[PDB]
Amino acid sequence: MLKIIIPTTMLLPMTWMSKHNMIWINATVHSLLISLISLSLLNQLGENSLNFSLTFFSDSLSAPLLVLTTWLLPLMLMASQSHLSKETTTRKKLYITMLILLQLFLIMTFTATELILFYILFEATLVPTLIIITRWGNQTERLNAGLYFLFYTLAGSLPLLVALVYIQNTTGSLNFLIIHYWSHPLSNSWSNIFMWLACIMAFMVKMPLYGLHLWLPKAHVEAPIAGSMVLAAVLLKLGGYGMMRITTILNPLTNYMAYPFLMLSMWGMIMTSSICLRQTDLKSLIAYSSVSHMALVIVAIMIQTPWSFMGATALMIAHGLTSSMLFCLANTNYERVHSRTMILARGLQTLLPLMATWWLMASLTNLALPPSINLIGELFIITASFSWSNITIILMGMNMMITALYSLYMLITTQRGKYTHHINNIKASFTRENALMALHILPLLLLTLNPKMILGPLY
Amino acid sequence: AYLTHQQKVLRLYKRALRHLESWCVHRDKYRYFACLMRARFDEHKNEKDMVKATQLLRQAEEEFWYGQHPQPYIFPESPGGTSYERYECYKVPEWCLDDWHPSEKAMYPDYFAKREQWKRLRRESWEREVKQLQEETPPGGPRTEALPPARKEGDLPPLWWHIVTRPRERPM
């Protein structure tokens, strides 16, 4: 994996050593180049992970996720030079440094072979995200959000720490390979249940799971645009990635100790999507939508079913691409009107003709319209859950009904309708905004042709 | 501010006939029943006592509510009509034209130059029109939403740009 980590690390001096106004260009072009090298790993061998060394390994689970992060890196960079341009050279240089330190930790996390090495970088993503949210966040409540974000995931991660070290002293090794081959049946002793709770709660908090989900509406609403997407597009998936990886030793205790989470998730999706049916703030609307889609993956993972797992990873990446995109949609309109309220800016299709389209198939992809991989993800989970229980469809099917009503609702209120009379500062959309939207839509629909590169190891 | 008794009963008259359109349909039936409505409205002119008039219209509104047509004939270019706000997704406001591009701007030089003429006139008329507004403003804030007209010569009436330069009802 050093063909990716090393250029990413060497890009850190690259930005700092750059000139005054060339930082955006060099960082963008090389990050895009880093993305291209990441695509070299999409080929996964028959039934073996592409084990490179003891330090780093990759399989069909992290292969799509890794290139999603590298592909993301230009997109935050392409979404940041609007509000950041009115700042000193150092602070802009610092901002780029953080995201690159962010992706570097993310790249190391997905490729880590050892659960402890997984663990260290998995919490380490807090440090750059926390400062990004707090420093450049354009709001007042962000100060409370940083505390809410940091403690909430840490409050679950710290009990996780004691779980891994216990496994190391008891079972022996702790890497992703030996655990799978030396997996032993977990008993029903009450101590095993608490270890199950410790080994699981840390991952559910970052998903999030309904109830333990209040840190998204705080963080996402007033996070900076660049930090908003990564936290929405991968950092939620980071909690997801550990769910497949760590549920190799928690069998068969998963069958009995999952009912509270399934009930919390299968009911939370209806409740959280019911949140989305009415939101005064567009960004809050998108953040809660991420809760519902992620709650689908929690159901997907907890069943622990072949079909369920492939649907989980397919939805996991697909949601990240569209959720990041919709956040870019919010940033554009919020930039023109300098506010976040729904009804303030309306009838924007007439004023901006192309953005009417960009927000349109963004909503369709959010709607899991077939064959968009959002559908191939959600539909797989329904089939797996229905096999698990025939009444799952009543709830999870009703989600697609509720998901439709709010998804178009933001399309109806903002894009369609009559133009706002007093608003007159909306200029023609710059080609940067239009291009950035295409950098999200095109890979999504392009990847629809070959879902086998997103269906994960269980494919 | 206050729809007086005469204003309300005329409003009752206008709405009553419009509903009776949907009922009578055919014109010959219309001209008869409208005349009864007219004749039976003329009879209570010497009612004198205003209290009776409220009682005379008390049963009238509910009687209209009794015989109101569930599908009244509402006019297409009106609220509730089929062609209501339909021809609106094309009337982009005037101020959007300022954000045009010079290549686009050079396409229509004469109109753009004349628009600049209207642009300057609004700039010159603003100070006079805002000054005129406050010089005869009523005490304790504006009491009536009606705005003063242009009193002297040359000066344009205050708050005119959006009314005058409103998009046409048939922009296409």
Partner: peptide
């Protein structure tokens, strides 16, 4: 008779 039509700039 032809007359001017207002349209948001699509050149960008």
């Amino acid at each position: 008779k032809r007359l001017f039509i207002i349209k948001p700039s699509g050149f960008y």
